[PDB]
Amino acid sequence: YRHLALLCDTMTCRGHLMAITRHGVNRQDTGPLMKCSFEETVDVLMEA
Amino acid sequence: ESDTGLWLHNKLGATDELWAPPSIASLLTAAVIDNIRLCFHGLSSAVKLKLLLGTLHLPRRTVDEMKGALMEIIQLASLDSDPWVLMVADILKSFPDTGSLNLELEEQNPNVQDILGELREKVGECEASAMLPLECQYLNKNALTTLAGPLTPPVKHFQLKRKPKSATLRAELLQKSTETAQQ
Amino acid sequence: LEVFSRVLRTSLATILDGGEENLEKNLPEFAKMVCHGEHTYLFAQAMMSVLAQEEQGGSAVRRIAQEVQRFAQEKGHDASQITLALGTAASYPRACQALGAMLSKGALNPADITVLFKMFTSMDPPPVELIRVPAFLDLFMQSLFKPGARINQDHKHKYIHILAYAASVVETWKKNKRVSINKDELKSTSKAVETVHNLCCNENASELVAELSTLYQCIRFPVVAMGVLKWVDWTVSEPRYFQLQTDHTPVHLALLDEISTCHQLLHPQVLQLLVKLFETEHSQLDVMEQLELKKTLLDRMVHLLSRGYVLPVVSYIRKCLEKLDTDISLIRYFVTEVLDVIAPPYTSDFVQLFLPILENDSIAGTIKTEGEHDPVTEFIAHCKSNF
Amino acid sequence: FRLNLSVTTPYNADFDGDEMNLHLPQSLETRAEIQELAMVPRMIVTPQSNRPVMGIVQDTLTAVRKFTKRDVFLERGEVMNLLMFLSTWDGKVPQPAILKPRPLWTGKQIFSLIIPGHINCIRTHSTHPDDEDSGPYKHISPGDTKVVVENGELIMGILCKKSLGTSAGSLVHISYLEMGHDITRLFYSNIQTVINNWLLIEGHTIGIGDSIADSKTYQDIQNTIKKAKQDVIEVIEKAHNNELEPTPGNTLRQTFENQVNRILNDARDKTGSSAQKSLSEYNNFKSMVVSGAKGSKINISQVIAVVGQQNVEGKRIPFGFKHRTLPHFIKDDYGPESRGFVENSYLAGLTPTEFFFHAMGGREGLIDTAVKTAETGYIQRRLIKSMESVMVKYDATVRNSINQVVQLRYGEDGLAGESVEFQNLATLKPSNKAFEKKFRFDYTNERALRRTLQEDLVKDVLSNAHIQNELEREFERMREDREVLRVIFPTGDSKVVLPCNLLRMIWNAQKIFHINPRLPSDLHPIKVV
Amino acid sequence: AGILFEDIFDVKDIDPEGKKFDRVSRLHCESESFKMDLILDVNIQIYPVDLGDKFRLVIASTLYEDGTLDDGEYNPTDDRPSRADQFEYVMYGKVYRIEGDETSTEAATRLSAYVSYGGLLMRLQGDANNLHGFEVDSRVYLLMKKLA
Amino acid sequence: SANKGEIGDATPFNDAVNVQKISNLLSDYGYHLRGNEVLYNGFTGRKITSQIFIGPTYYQRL
Ligand SMILES: [Mg+2]
């Protein structure tokens, strides 16, 4: 339950739902090279 | 055996179980109770009761082999002044003599006479609507008329305006039974 | 001794004053001190054995002896040999020893039953009560009509003839002497019981229905009827019995109906089986299928109500509505069918027993599409006219 | 590469051509930190399910099961051969179980020598009878099916998978809890060595004699399947002549297939029950499955009794041809053989049609395995790249790379996942009266206080009413705690996750200090409070 | 010296529920005078036991008559005399359970001692006055002889 | 087949030969009905406590 509740609260901690997609993780400003290390690289670096 | 009075007291010392304990008929031995003949009054009244119950529980073939020791135990228990031991002696004084337990217990018991009289007159005044035996459930109607006489008629509380649907479907499946028989 | 005899007197007087409805209630609290000590048990056995030797009330007293002996049997007593000693079967030592050994074993021995047949099938039979004792016939019920446990059938005719002698023959006790006996019905009883035993052996469904017709013709016999009753009890009470249904086990449930129709004395046992089946919840099934199975069980129990076991049926309805509340749809369906099957005149006790269940729990919900005949309105009118 | 099966078990390694990678750090501090963090005794137990993951491999598991069977009587020469391979052996021979006529030890004695430390545990065997628990003989096991160990001495019980494997609260798990991880590693190695040597002496095989059954039960199987087949043909004829009444909630076709599935499931279950009743108790299949090493009771049923009905996409095999599963059957038939039920066993062999159906099932399983592995790899990569940034700071809270607080404590408790343990709470579920009789400690019952406490203790408790006030205050507090527990758990469940297993520490303290609780207590309740 | 218990017993029933293990079997006994109930595992292979057999029993602490109370190590080279010189079956193990038919008000009248003989069980239910000698977690023996 | 002196046939859907007939051939050639035999330890020399299955087959290295 520690890990499960930690996953769910890290999902919901931004005041709204966070589906594990580029379509969310690009919207959170959690590091341009985190975004680059995600599946899209050139667009997120190029926007940063 | 040696110190068989204290031995039997140890075996039957469990007074929390007022019935006949198991395996006492197997534990009993002819010479052991031949020694209990002369050490009989030393041991306790409850132990006397359990020993009498064990001698009653003893198999009939052993009883036939050693009728006399049971006679000695019967007369010792009759000489005993405990009311319960006396009643047990009265009930099993005819057990080895004939085979059945004693039915003529009418001697020296006015409480038994009074209770027998009031129970006989009570069942005489209330014998109507005699509630049926399980053995009369087992046997059929003809033997019921033979033994219990007339049967209790059913008592009806309402009117059946039409034949029930359960009986209707029972008749329908009886017709289907006739069909499945004729295929 | 005096206190126990006086308490025994008061309890027996209360039981005899009450009767059957008193029999299902105060017998555990009577059995708890007449079975507490086996010496007290033997004294009571002597007393009411003399009472059964008295002819008037002897049937009711012998029934009390039977149920006290049964209660001692599940309590832990080994007084089968003692009951035989009270009985006349102790006059014959070999018969008493063999019957006591078989009762202590609680099963059936082919060699012992050949011994019983051989001391039977004779020109001088013993007094029939040693085979009329119901615990020995309970042993036959357990051994014979089980769905499993097939017997070796070497002495099958001996078993069936022993049941026929136990449930068929009569005698006339003129000064404790038998001079007139009947033996013409034991052959038909043997044929019926043998047919039922072959049905239990072959245990198979189209041929089961085709022989179910002849089975009903045998169900006209009472020993056949309750043997089939307990066989159906075992078969249904076997778990996962409900894997295929056409009308929620209509063959066995119509066997229940025919048993209740043919014999009015089997209604308490039929009721016990039905309430056990209703109390048992079967999992791994559709909820709607379980709902309709409970509805069909209520259909059979309303059939019992039509055959006339109406006061205990309404009593069990009131009890099951008070504690462990079942479905309101089931209660409404039972009430609607009971009002369909009843008609005036009405007994005041029956109306009082059926009242609170009728005026609680959505009378407007019970009224759905009656139209032509108003069940509850006429019941209100008859109740107000009576009271 | 040469390595241990206790390391293969977490590695998912099974020696069918699987090769491993081996990295060696160059830097000495990296070597030291790898030594002191990623080492096998230091990480015996996983955090995710607080269970041991080293385990015991199948062959040594079955061998130690046959070694811990009750009737093991071992010769002096063999015990002599065995007790070199204990690394942590003290060097003294133990007393034999049998001394006269011949000196014979026992496997429980040898396993008591194997187990280091002094650990108290009770485990249940896989074939342990719950009715034997309910009735008498709960402390004298007729089948030795109650695993009991006390003070580092294995009392009774046949060890199995449920007692020695990855199960929660296992013997190796509580050993890693209590004594040193290096000691538990030596315990594993000693088990492997001596159980391998006892298996070398004993011998363990599988054969056709083990896989074959008897003709009477074979006839039982044929009668059962014939009854089921004629019953389902009766149901099919009922549907043909349309006496079938459809169940509400589904169509007649769905009701019919539900009936067929119910009948076939009941028949197959009865067949398996009959076989497992008649496995004759000398089958190595039975022995190894009871050890819990591999296989299953249903696998005995397919290999011996009958394969049974195979299902594709959660249903029967559809009509791939024109309303027929095969051209070998007629058009529009719904027989179990024609639709995918196998009437034969593996020992009996299969017709080519049901062999094709088993191929259907095997291909379905294999395609499921392939797509499962691929998709779970992609999903795990997604989850990792999602939450590669969350870690706990020195203030015991959870912050991301943005240092935003998410959890005030780790898992809202700040307690380690390896340290947390299953626990049963007795406060929640019993009645108020039972709670009072179990937690009040009434001081008025003078006989009870004489039996429980000493004479000075009872006279001081009765003299000081302030102590009684403190006990009553504690009782009110735990009543409020019971109310709090009934609030937090509306469900009637008493299982919880807790860092400590207090019952085990009670047992360990008792057997360390030799309490002998027949004597009255010597500790004051005010001291307890 | 060291005898915790000594009595006569009779094998009346052997493993009536079933025959599970091949080279060991459990036997049921009742004391001739002390009302002691006994169920004991025994090796049929080396010590054959027939039903209805009469045998003699001593549970003792140490083997020797001197009451030395040895540590319990297997020392076949010792020559101090013991009861095992004349005895025919000796069995050693740990007692693990001693319970009683007791409540909060009254003491234990029936005492039950469950002893584990390494891999063998013995349960002795009987009278507390004779079973006060047993105490939990002690080295005890069995001292079986079979008497004619 | 090795004890008999002939090449065995293992056609799948024959259904004319079975394990009972094979055990009959084993009893004919004198060996055990279920193909188990007694093995002897190479290190100690004591017999293996359990019977051991043995026999030829066809293996391939890869
Ligand atoms: Mg692999």
Side-chain angles (χ1 to χ4, degrees), chain A, chain B, chain C residues 1-173 186-283 285-367 371 374-387, chain D, chain E, chain F:
Chain A
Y1 181 74
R2 283 90 164 276
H3 315 127
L4 190 152
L6 193 140
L7 176 69
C8 79
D9 64 42
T10 45
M11 192 305 298
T12 188
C13 66
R14 283 265 61 76
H16 58 283
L17 73 165
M18 171 65 198
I20 305 306
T21 55
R22 41 166 160 145
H23 283 103
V25 76
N26 281 0
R27 306 286 89 78
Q28 292 88 20
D29 47 356
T30 61
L33 298 156
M34 293 297 102
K35 289 187 291 185
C36 168
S37 192
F38 208 70
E39 65 182 1
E40 171 56 51
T41 80
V42 53
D43 299 336
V44 294
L45 281 183
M46 164 76 168
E47 186 176 1
Chain B
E1 66 161 74
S2 305
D3 197 16
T4 184
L6 190 52
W7 168 84
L8 193 74
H9 189 273
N10 281 35
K11 304 307 255 194
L12 308 173
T15 59
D16 305 332
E17 195 264 339
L18 276 195
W19 309 337
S23 304
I24 301 303
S26 309
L27 283 175
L28 284 188
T29 305
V32 166
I33 62 170
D34 286 335
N35 203 0
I36 298 291
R37 289 182 181 178
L38 73 164
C39 73
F40 185 76
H41 280 46
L43 59 85
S44 300
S45 295
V47 190
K48 284 193 284 291
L49 169 62
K50 302 313 186 75
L51 172 66
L52 283 161
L53 296 184
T55 53
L56 191 150
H57 186 70
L58 274 170
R60 200 50 203 189
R61 298 278 81 80
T62 303
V63 173
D64 291 327
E65 294 147 18
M66 40 75 67
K67 290 269 190 264
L70 295 177
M71 295 298 102
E72 304 314 302
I73 296 299
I74 279 161
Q75 59 91 25
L76 281 174
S78 77
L79 283 175
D80 291 328
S81 62
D82 200 9
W84 284 104
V85 178
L86 184 142
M87 187 66 204
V88 166
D90 293 330
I91 191 60
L92 63 91
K93 80 158 79 74
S94 177
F95 185 73
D97 280 327
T98 310
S100 302
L101 280 171
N102 192 12
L103 302 183
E104 185 66 33
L105 312 165
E106 291 188 3
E107 279 76 20
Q108 52 94 36
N109 45 6
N111 193 3
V112 168
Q113 276 81 75
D114 291 332
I115 291 301
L116 261 181
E118 55 82 24
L119 274 182
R120 168 66 269 176
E121 66 92 21
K122 207 263 169 184
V123 68
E125 63 94 15
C126 184
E127 58 202 30
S129 296
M131 61 67 58
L132 268 296
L134 288 149
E135 75 181 16
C136 282
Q137 172 71 83
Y138 270 111
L139 60 83
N140 46 63
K141 197 256 182 182
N142 195 2
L144 189 152
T145 314
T146 302
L147 172 62
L151 74 164
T152 57
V155 181
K156 198 68 164 66
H157 300 334
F158 66 98
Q159 197 270 330
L160 193 73
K161 85 174 198 291
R162 88 286 184 279
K163 181 262 289 181
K165 287 169 64 178
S166 300
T168 315
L169 61 83
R170 186 170 100 198
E172 294 157 1
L173 67 94
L174 190 149
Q175 191 265 329
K176 292 191 284 293
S177 312
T178 313
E179 296 325 290
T180 56
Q182 64 85 29
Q183 290 100 26
Chain C
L1 164 72
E2 301 173 356
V3 184
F4 178 71
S5 62
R6 217 172 60 253
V7 166
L8 174 75
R9 163 197 86 94
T10 53
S11 299
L12 282 171
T14 310
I15 290 166
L16 195 52
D17 282 331
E20 291 91 4
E21 205 270 332
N22 190 359
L23 169 67
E24 288 89 6
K25 55 174 187 281
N26 70 352
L27 266 297
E29 48 256 31
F30 161 79
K32 67 97 173 179
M33 73 290 291
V34 308
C35 296
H36 175 269
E38 190 276 331
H39 48 281
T40 66
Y41 180 81
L42 185 44
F43 156 75
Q45 280 292 332
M47 261 295 188
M48 65 180 288
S49 67
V50 179
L51 294 179
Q53 282 311 122
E54 311 301 314
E55 43 171 355
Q56 288 182 351
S59 67
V61 174
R62 187 165 187 174
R63 174 56 182 278
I64 298 172
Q66 286 155 358
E67 54 86 23
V68 170
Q69 188 262 333
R70 197 166 321 278
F71 191 90
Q73 281 291 333
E74 70 273 15
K75 198 46 74 181
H77 285 268
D78 46 339
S80 57
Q81 180 49 56
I82 311 172
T83 308
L84 289 187
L86 271 300
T88 301
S91 312
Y92 313 94
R94 188 161 184 255
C96 170
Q97 169 200 9
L99 196 46
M102 201 195 258
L103 282 181
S104 307
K105 288 315 170 182
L108 269 298
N109 201 358
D112 210 317
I113 205 163
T114 50
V115 165
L116 271 295
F117 179 78
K118 182 191 69 174
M119 52 76 88
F120 286 136
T121 191
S122 307
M123 295 298 102
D124 45 349
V128 66
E129 64 183 1
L130 78 165
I131 205 169
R132 286 289 157 79
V133 65
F136 181 66
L137 309 174
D138 279 326
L139 296 194
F140 289 107
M141 183 46 257
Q142 297 155 10
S143 59
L144 206 68
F145 298 111
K146 190 74 185 293
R150 301 276 90 81
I151 210 64
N152 50 353
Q153 291 189 9
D154 45 8
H155 317 289
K156 183 194 212 182
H157 62 288
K158 296 196 177 62
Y159 304 125
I160 305 309
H161 173 274
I162 284 303
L163 276 296
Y165 183 81
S168 299
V169 306
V170 308
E171 81 270 11
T172 59
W173 287 119
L186 65 94
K187 186 66 182 70
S188 193
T189 314
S190 294
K191 172 193 307 176
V193 169
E194 171 82 5
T195 311
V196 177
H197 194 88
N198 302 307
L199 189 150
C200 295
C201 287
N202 62 24
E203 77 196 8
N204 201 68
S206 174
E207 71 95 20
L208 190 149
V209 181
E211 77 195 351
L212 177 80
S213 178
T214 303
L215 179 59
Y216 290 128
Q217 306 297 290
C218 297
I219 281 300
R220 294 165 185 185
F221 288 86
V223 56
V224 174
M226 71 205 158
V228 165
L229 182 63
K230 286 295 295 169
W231 170 75
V232 162
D233 183 12
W234 277 326
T235 311
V236 175
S237 179
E238 193 262 337
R240 206 42 182 280
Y241 173 73
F242 298 92
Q243 75 269 13
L244 73 165
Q245 273 70 238
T246 181
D247 205 17
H248 300 270
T249 301
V251 172
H252 296 240
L253 266 61
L255 275 170
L256 265 294
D257 285 335
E258 189 86 31
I259 283 157
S260 88
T261 311
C262 287
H263 313 291
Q264 65 178 0
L265 299 177
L266 280 165
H267 277 95
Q269 294 84 56
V270 164
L271 181 80
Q272 179 61 43
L273 163 63
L274 285 179
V275 302
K276 175 184 60 62
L277 292 181
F278 184 75
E279 279 146 13
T280 46
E281 285 300 315
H282 192 273
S283 293
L285 275 190
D286 181 31
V287 178
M288 283 73 74
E289 285 271 325
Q290 293 161 193
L291 190 70
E292 296 295 325
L293 179 54
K294 293 322 179 69
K295 281 191 183 308
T296 307
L297 288 177
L298 273 295
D299 292 327
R300 304 293 96 98
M301 179 194 116
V302 175
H303 181 271
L304 270 70
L305 186 134
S306 312
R307 301 282 85 78
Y309 202 62
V310 61
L311 305 181
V313 162
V314 181
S315 172
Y316 181 80
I317 282 297
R318 191 159 177 179
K319 165 206 313 173
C320 77
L321 190 148
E322 284 151 343
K323 61 98 177 178
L324 272 77
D325 47 352
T326 182
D327 209 313
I328 305 168
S329 161
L330 270 297
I331 301 306
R332 166 191 297 107
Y333 183 69
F334 167 80
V335 161
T336 310
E337 284 195 344
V338 161
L339 291 152
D340 287 330
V341 306
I342 62 172
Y346 283 157
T347 293
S348 61
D349 177 74
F350 153 74
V351 166
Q352 162 202 10
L353 202 48
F354 199 67
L355 195 68
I357 317 293
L358 188 138
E359 292 83 4
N360 63 0
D361 201 359
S362 84
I363 303 100
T366 62
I367 296 184
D374 308 333
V376 310
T377 306
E378 293 297 322
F379 197 86
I380 292 298
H382 301 125
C383 176
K384 294 296 115 176
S385 69
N386 198 1
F387 297 130
Chain D
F1 287 164
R2 331 289 288 276
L3 59 85
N4 192 13
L5 276 299
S6 288
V7 176
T8 69
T9 292
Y11 276 7
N12 274 17
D14 61 357
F15 302 111
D16 53 359
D18 301 10
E19 72 193 3
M20 295 298 102
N21 314 338
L22 171 66
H23 315 95
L24 161 68
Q26 214 75 17
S27 161
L28 193 145
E29 54 92 11
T30 58
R31 181 171 147 281
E33 69 182 359
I34 286 302
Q35 183 179 2
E36 298 299 322
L37 302 176
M39 188 66 204
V40 297
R42 299 170 94 80
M43 155 180 176
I44 293 297
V45 169
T46 192
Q48 53 186 1
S49 182
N50 56 58
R51 275 172 327 127
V53 300
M54 295 298 102
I56 288 297
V57 69
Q58 41 172 10
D59 301 12
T60 60
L61 181 49
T62 304
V64 72
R65 184 254 169 184
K66 298 299 282 292
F67 181 72
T68 194
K69 275 190 65 168
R70 183 198 276 167
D71 48 4
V72 285
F73 296 134
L74 213 65
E75 203 48 49
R76 184 184 76 102
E78 186 162 347
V79 168
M80 183 278 288
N81 180 39
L82 268 189
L83 282 72
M84 284 73 74
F85 296 84
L86 279 81
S87 62
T88 72
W89 191 42
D90 52 355
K92 315 167 188 180
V93 61
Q95 200 75 251
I98 312 295
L99 283 155
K100 198 168 185 181
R102 281 200 152 139
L104 296 179
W105 283 257
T106 184
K108 301 194 200 39
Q109 270 179 318
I110 307 304
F111 209 96
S112 299
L113 269 295
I114 297 165
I115 291 177
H118 301 85
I119 317 294
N120 292 318
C121 188
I122 281 182
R123 302 282 271 183
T124 62
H125 198 51
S126 304
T127 79
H128 185 90
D130 292 332
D131 58 356
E132 177 199 311
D133 287 331
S134 316
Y137 299 82
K138 57 185 68 61
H139 297 283
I140 185 167
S141 299
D144 197 46
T145 65
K146 189 78 161 186
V147 176
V148 173
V149 57
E150 187 269 337
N151 206 53
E153 208 285 325
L154 195 141
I155 307 299
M156 293 297 103
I158 293 168
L159 296 164
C160 54
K161 191 259 290 181
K162 305 197 51 59
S163 68
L164 301 181
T166 68
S167 162
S170 173
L171 189 152
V172 292
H173 181 88
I174 62 177
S175 160
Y176 171 79
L177 274 187
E178 301 307 315
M179 73 291 291
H181 51 96
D182 197 26
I183 307 304
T184 318
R185 155 194 88 85
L186 290 163
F187 179 47
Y188 271 131
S189 180
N190 280 348
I191 281 183
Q192 265 172 347
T193 49
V194 309
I195 292 312
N196 200 8
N197 284 10
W198 188 83
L199 181 58
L200 183 137
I201 306 302
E202 167 70 27
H204 172 239
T205 189
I206 197 64
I208 296 91
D210 308 340
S211 160
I212 196 159
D214 62 357
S215 70
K216 64 179 72 66
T217 54
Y218 285 156
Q219 186 59 224
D220 296 330
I221 302 311
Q222 284 104 29
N223 298 324
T224 301
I225 65 166
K226 281 299 293 296
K227 179 179 68 65
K229 281 287 296 208
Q230 63 91 51
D231 216 323
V232 68
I233 293 299
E234 185 268 336
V235 173
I236 287 169
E237 179 263 342
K238 177 188 174 187
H240 280 307
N241 288 317
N242 288 173
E243 294 93 8
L244 182 59
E245 304 94 325
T247 294
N250 52 359
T251 68
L252 185 136
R253 165 74 43 80
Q254 185 166 358
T255 308
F256 159 73
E257 69 188 1
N258 289 12
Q259 295 293 339
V260 168
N261 292 316
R262 214 158 310 167
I263 291 189
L264 270 297
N265 287 317
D266 211 4
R268 177 194 42 79
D269 182 76
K270 195 190 302 174
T271 296
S273 172
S274 55
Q276 299 169 6
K277 178 188 67 39
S278 61
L279 289 178
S280 79
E281 284 96 15
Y282 267 88
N283 191 357
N284 290 295
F285 284 150
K286 164 76 72 197
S287 167
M288 184 278 288
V289 170
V290 167
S291 68
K294 187 57 81 174
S296 70
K297 291 308 184 181
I298 206 72
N299 295 141
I300 296 89
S301 75
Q302 291 92 23
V303 74
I304 285 181
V306 71
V307 170
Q309 166 75 62
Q310 294 152 351
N311 295 331
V312 61
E313 66 198 0
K315 66 187 55 54
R316 332 182 71 194
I317 293 162
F319 291 150
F321 304 101
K322 290 191 289 182
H323 320 94
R324 47 192 203 157
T325 47
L326 275 174
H328 297 57
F329 312 103
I330 67 175
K331 274 194 180 181
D332 297 4
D333 45 355
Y334 286 78
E337 182 189 6
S338 179
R339 287 288 274 167
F341 166 63
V342 183
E343 289 83 4
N344 307 323
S345 83
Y346 279 139
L347 179 55
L350 313 179
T351 69
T353 64
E354 60 209 346
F355 171 74
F356 200 76
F357 301 153
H358 189 56
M360 281 315 208
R363 285 282 297 277
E364 191 274 334
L366 264 58
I367 187 172
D368 289 332
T369 302
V371 301
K372 178 179 73 175
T373 316
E375 183 65 27
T376 194
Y378 195 28
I379 290 302
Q380 185 210 298
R381 212 278 304 268
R382 264 199 264 260
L383 280 190
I384 287 179
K385 280 296 186 182
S386 163
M387 183 178 71
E388 266 181 352
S389 58
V390 167
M391 61 79 71
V392 169
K393 297 296 188 174
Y394 294 113
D395 54 354
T397 192
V398 168
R399 286 142 83 80
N400 50 357
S401 67
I402 319 296
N403 296 107
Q404 315 206 28
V405 288
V406 189
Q407 263 203 324
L408 301 194
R409 309 288 154 233
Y410 157 59
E412 68 186 0
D413 217 352
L415 302 177
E418 309 185 340
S419 80
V420 65
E421 193 84 2
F422 285 95
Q423 199 41 243
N424 202 326
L425 188 51
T427 286
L428 172 62
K429 195 177 293 295
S431 179
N432 311 319
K433 47 189 184 300
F435 180 82
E436 164 185 10
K437 293 189 296 292
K438 205 175 181 185
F439 295 90
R440 179 67 181 271
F441 196 47
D442 183 72
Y443 45 90
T444 68
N445 195 6
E446 307 174 358
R447 305 194 40 80
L449 276 296
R450 297 309 278 212
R451 297 292 179 87
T452 47
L453 271 67
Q454 294 174 329
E455 57 272 13
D456 300 333
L457 273 66
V458 55
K459 77 178 182 64
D460 290 332
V461 159
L462 293 181
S463 72
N464 198 5
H466 157 73
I467 291 171
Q468 304 149 24
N469 300 340
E470 296 301 320
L471 276 69
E472 194 56 46
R473 184 64 53 77
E474 197 182 13
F475 189 75
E476 289 282 347
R477 287 182 294 171
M478 65 184 73
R479 277 198 269 200
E480 194 267 344
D481 292 331
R482 177 154 168 255
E483 192 274 332
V484 161
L485 264 294
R486 292 181 186 283
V487 166
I488 181 60
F489 292 104
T491 316
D493 43 354
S494 49
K495 180 70 67 69
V496 71
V497 286
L498 281 179
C500 300
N501 211 345
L502 302 189
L503 307 184
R504 317 293 207 204
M505 282 74 75
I506 300 299
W507 204 341
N508 203 0
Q510 276 151 341
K511 304 305 166 296
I512 278 176
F513 279 81
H514 192 46
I515 286 302
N516 200 343
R518 310 210 48 78
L519 308 182
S521 290
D522 312 325
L523 183 62
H524 301 267
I526 180 167
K527 268 75 175 176
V528 180
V529 176
Chain E
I3 295 91
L4 296 102
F5 193 68
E6 166 176 359
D7 212 34
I8 309 294
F9 280 87
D10 187 81
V11 172
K12 297 176 177 64
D13 205 332
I14 44 171
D15 56 21
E17 48 169 283
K19 184 43 166 46
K20 300 298 302 303
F21 313 98
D22 53 356
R23 45 182 181 155
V24 76
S25 175
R26 61 172 63 254
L27 52 82
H28 294 57
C29 299
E30 195 269 328
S31 168
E32 84 280 17
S33 56
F34 279 3
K35 268 286 194 286
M36 302 284 177
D37 298 347
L38 186 138
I39 289 169
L40 170 65
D41 297 330
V42 71
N43 195 351
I44 299 306
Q45 190 175 1
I46 62 172
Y47 200 74
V49 163
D50 197 73
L51 190 149
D53 278 11
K54 210 61 168 167
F55 68 100
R56 198 263 298 172
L57 180 148
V58 169
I59 297 89
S61 295
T62 179
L63 307 155
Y64 318 114
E65 291 82 6
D66 297 331
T68 75
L69 274 297
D70 52 337
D71 47 355
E73 307 318 294
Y74 172 60
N75 301 315
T77 56
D78 181 29
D79 297 325
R80 173 159 57 245
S82 67
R83 277 81 54 84
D85 299 333
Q86 68 263 17
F87 263 88
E88 67 178 3
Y89 203 58
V90 291
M91 187 66 204
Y92 160 70
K94 201 60 69 192
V95 63
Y96 66 97
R97 178 182 173 82
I98 291 173
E99 69 97 19
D101 195 1
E102 50 187 341
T103 188
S104 173
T105 65
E106 62 98 25
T109 61
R110 299 277 83 80
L111 271 192
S112 309
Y114 293 78
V115 62
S116 81
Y117 282 146
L120 279 74
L121 286 160
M122 183 278 288
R123 176 219 41 73
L124 180 54
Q125 292 169 318
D127 203 3
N129 58 351
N130 280 258
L131 302 181
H132 282 92
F134 295 154
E135 61 86 20
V136 178
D137 198 6
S138 59
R139 291 180 178 90
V140 293
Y141 301 132
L142 192 56
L143 281 74
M144 294 298 102
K145 264 196 184 179
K146 162 74 184 67
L147 62 96
Chain F
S1 290
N3 297 139
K4 197 169 179 55
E6 275 88 5
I7 290 298
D9 43 350
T11 60
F13 323 107
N14 194 7
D15 210 23
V17 66
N18 49 0
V19 64
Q20 212 65 35
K21 183 177 177 68
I22 296 312
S23 315
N24 294 142
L25 293 177
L26 275 170
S27 181
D28 169 73
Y29 276 88
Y31 288 95
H32 181 254
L33 273 296
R34 296 292 183 269
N36 296 317
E37 278 89 6
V38 173
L39 265 288
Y40 288 69
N41 194 357
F43 318 125
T44 71
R46 188 195 175 280
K47 289 160 198 161
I48 303 300
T49 306
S50 180
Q51 61 272 16
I52 295 305
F53 203 91
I54 200 166
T57 179
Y58 202 62
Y59 282 173
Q60 302 149 348
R61 70 185 299 257
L62 290 185

